[PDB]
Amino acid sequence: KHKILHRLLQDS
Amino acid sequence: ENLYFQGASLTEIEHLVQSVCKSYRETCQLRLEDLLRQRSNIFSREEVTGYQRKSMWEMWERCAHHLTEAIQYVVEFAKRLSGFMELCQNDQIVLLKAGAMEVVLVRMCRAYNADNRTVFFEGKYGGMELFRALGCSELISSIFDFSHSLSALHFSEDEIALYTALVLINAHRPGLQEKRKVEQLQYNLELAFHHHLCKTHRQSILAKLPPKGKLRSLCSQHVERLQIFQHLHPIVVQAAFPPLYKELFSGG
Numbered sequence: 335k336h337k338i339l340h341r342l343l344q345d346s
Numbered sequence: 347e348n349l350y351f352q353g354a355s356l357t358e359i360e361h362l363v364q365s366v367c368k369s370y371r372e373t374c375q376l377r378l379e380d381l382l383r384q385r386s387n388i389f390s391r392e393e394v395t396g397y398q399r400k401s402m403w404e405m406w407e408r409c410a411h412h413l414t415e416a417i418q419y420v421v422e423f424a425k426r427l428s429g430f431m432e433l434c435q436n437d438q439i440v441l442l443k444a445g446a447m448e449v450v451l452v453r454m455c456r457a458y459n460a461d462n463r464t465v466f467f468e469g470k471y472g473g474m475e476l477f478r479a480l481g482c483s484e485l486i487s488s489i490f491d492f493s494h495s496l497s498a499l500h501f502s503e504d505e506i507a508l509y510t511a512l513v514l515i516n517a518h519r520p521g522l523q524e525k526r527k528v529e530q531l532q533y534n535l536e537l538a539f540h541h542h543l544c545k546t547h548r549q550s551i552l553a554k555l556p557p558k559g560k561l562r563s564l565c566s567q568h569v570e571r572l573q574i575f576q577h578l579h580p581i582v583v584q585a586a587f588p589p590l591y592k593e594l595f596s597g598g
């Protein structure tokens with residue numbers, strides 16, 4: 335149940 | 347939210363060309379000059395054989411890792427693209443899940459040498475025979491043919507920048523909640539691309555670009571060959587495949 339996109343999208 | 351979510355003037359379209367080309371230069375992963383210079387660096391018969399002797403699962407792992415690396419650069423490109431961060435999170439995820447692989451396939455033509463039919467992989471250039479251990483020869487040859495057809499267009503970096511921005515901002519992606527917002531953003535990016543081709547006398551390539559069905563077919567084939575591999579080596583996928591790769595191609 336991996337969800338990495340939301341992390342990359344939130345990382346500024 | 348964003349200027350490109352409404353009808354854009356010529357000066358604003360000119361401003362969009364510059365912006366898209368800047369986002370691409372900043373996130374292109376490998377510089378074209380470095381890829382072009384490495385063309386004379388080709389894997390030997392002995393190195394090719396070594397790759398062919400690798401296990402199917404070791405080869406799938408290495409390839410999934412190199413694809414994830416490329417995808418990460420496409421995520422950065424998306425984040426720097428005008429209007430993309432102004433879309434809702436659902437839509438950003440929908441857009442990247444459907445189009446990240448398509449952008450990578452398009453970007454790959456820069457790393458493909460039409461003269462000897464080789465691709466840049468792990469420091470050198472090798473032909474499709476390098477990937478024989480994967481057991482997906484139809485997919486590999488379809489990717490090489492696709493890269494060959496793009497290479498015949500002699501795409502500039504700016505052309506790749508504007509075309510890939512368009513591949514990503516596709517308002518026909520199933521599951522988009524702010525469809526009209528994506529449609530207007532798609533329309534301005536189409537104008538930006540077509541304006542740049544008009545300005546450089548490159549409109550002759552419009553009819554030579556692949557159909558959307560071609561990139562969709564390649565992505566469908568990728569997903570289908572990964573399902574076949576997964577059935578053979580489920581623990582390899584579960585333990586050693588990148589989490590981002592699994593989020594995009596095997597539903598998590």
Ligand SMILES: CCS(=O)(=O)c1ccc([C@@H](NC(C)=O)C(=O)Nc2ccc(C(O)(C(F)(F)F)C(F)(F)F)cc2)cc1
Pocket residue numbers: 374375376377409410412413416450453454455456457465466467468469477486489
């Ligand atoms: C895509 C952006 S760019 O042009 O800057 C750029 C090109 C090539 C590489 C290569 N960097 C390394 C270290 O290897 C690279 O990743 N090459 C590769 C070739 C084929 C593939 C494939 O998975 C396929 F073709 F399917 F995409 C393979 F052929 F193995 F199956 C997977 C990676 C990195 C960046």
Ligand code: NA
Pocket residue numbers: 455456457458459460497
């Ligand atoms: Na090429």
